[PDB]
């Protein structure tokens, strides 16, 4: 089982304040540290600080500004980040991590993106991108999906609810008038389309929202 | 506070070559450093822990060497799955701190594009806007160049391109061009056209439909 939840995505105007959580799940120790590590988009793994939950006291990286502060629930089993005065400087994927205290992190959590902007909570709308009755193919066919205007960062695209992951790949957004836009591209096999269905999900953790959309063949 | 410099900050080797990433600690950390692989977009994946020690569920070509301030690790044969960036952290001394990262990039033989040209949809029509996405699919090297055209003469406003970074299923590259238009706009022109120029062949590869 996931040994570390984290949910998706925060978006917080700049100077408020977030509470990162991170549920974990599996084997607990009075032993465990839970650490963070925070990412900027293109940029390495920075630690932030550590908790032990079974005492509660948690230690801060020095080298930084301190914006975190670490408490846990042992009750819920849940850690907790709380990252206070944000900048666009504190935009980034934070994620958690567990040490059994021999110092290696043997389980990450799959991380939080937090953007710190002005701008509104957008959902993307989602469309097909299937041939023109013009277009000639071979033994593979190409399919797609066009997640528009959506905001802020991420969204998690699948093929059939994740059972087509072969000849799948997924572009990064790009961003225009506070607004992300991209796209997912699927192959397979000509014969298999349209007989056996291929459906794109579009799952934004922002704005809760979670959309299929199947591709047929155009009219 | 340990600092861990991991150079080259980019490793290029061919399928199935053996290939090493570097860590060098400022002090001596005795065997105190674990390693971590990070795919695009996933989460840090741990592969080897005290130096050398195999973590289990980890491909047996995985493996890692060194003790003091230097140490390694070692792909045997490198595939397209190992595409990712490589990060060393050490536990030695408070507080653990990471190395700075290496990507490893696979050169593959050259493969051409294939390209693929997407209409508007209808649900997108309705909503007063029209997107025509172009697709430049597993190509390699990643060098290459997109041109629109829109009833025979070349298009250069309304268009956003993305790059994928490099593929960890086949070590390729791939590339989408979106050209958006109003729906007005795009009624009032028949032909779209989405060329791609790559090394691969001379001449470009040209994909188009038309509005009606």
């Known amino acids: 089982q996931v040994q570390l939840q984290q949910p998706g995505a925060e978006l917080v105007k700049p100077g408020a304040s977030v509470k990162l959580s991170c549920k974990a799940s599996?084997?607990?120790?009075?032993?465990?540290?839970i650490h963070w590590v925070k990412q900027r988009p293109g940029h390495g793994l920075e630690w932030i600080g550590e908790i032990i939950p079974s005492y509660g006291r948690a230690n801060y990286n020095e080298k930084i500004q301190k914006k975190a502060t670490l408490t846990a629930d042992k009750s819920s089993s849940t850690a907790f980040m709380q990252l206070s005065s944000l900048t666009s400087e504190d935009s980034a994927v934070y994620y958690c991590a567990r040490e059994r205290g021999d110092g290696y992190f043997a389980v990450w959590g799959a991380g939080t993106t937090v953007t710190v902007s002005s701008a509104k909570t957008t959902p993307p709308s989602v469309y097909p991108l299937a041939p023109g009755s013009a277009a000639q193919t071979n033994s593979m066919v190409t399919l797609g999906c066009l997640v528009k205007g959506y905001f802020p960062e991420p969204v998690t695209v699948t093929w059939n609810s994740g059972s087509l992951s072969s000849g799948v790949h997924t572009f990064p957004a790009v961003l225009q008038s506070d607004l992300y836009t991209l796209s997912s591209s699927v192959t397979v096999p000509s014969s298999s389309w349209p007989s056996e269905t291929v459906t794109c999900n579009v799952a934004h953790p922002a704005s809760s929202t979670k959309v299929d959309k199947k591709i047929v063949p155009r009219d | 506070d340990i600092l861990l410099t991991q150079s080259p900050a980019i490793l290029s080797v061919s399928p199935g070559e053996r290939v090493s990433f570097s860590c060098r600690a400022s002090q001596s950390i005795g065997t105190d450093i674990h390693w971590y692989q990070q795919r695009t977009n996933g989460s840090p994946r741990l592969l080897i822990k005290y130096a050398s020690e195999s973590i289990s569920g980890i491909p047996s070509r995985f493996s890692g060497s060194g003790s003091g301030t230097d140490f390694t690790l070692s792909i045997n044969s490198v595939e397209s799955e190992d595409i990712a960036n490589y990060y060393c952290q050490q536990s030695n001394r408070w507080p653990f701190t990471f190395g700075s990262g290496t990507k490893l990039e696979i050169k593959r033989a050259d493969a051409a594009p294939t390209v693929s040209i997407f209409p508007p949809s209808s649900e997108q029509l309705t909503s007063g806007g029209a997107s025509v996405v172009c697709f430049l699919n597993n190509f390699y090297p990643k060098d290459i160049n997109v041109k629109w055209k829109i009833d025979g003469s070349e298009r250069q406003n309304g268009v956003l391109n993305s790059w994928t970074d490099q593929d960890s299923k086949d070590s390729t590259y791939s590339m989408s061009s979106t050209l958006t238009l109003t729906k007005d706009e795009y009624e009032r022109h028949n032909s779209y056209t989405c060329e791609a120029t790559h090394k691969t062949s001379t001449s470009p590869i040209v994909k188009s439909f038309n509005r009606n």
């Open positions: 599996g084997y607990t120790f009075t032993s465990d540290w």
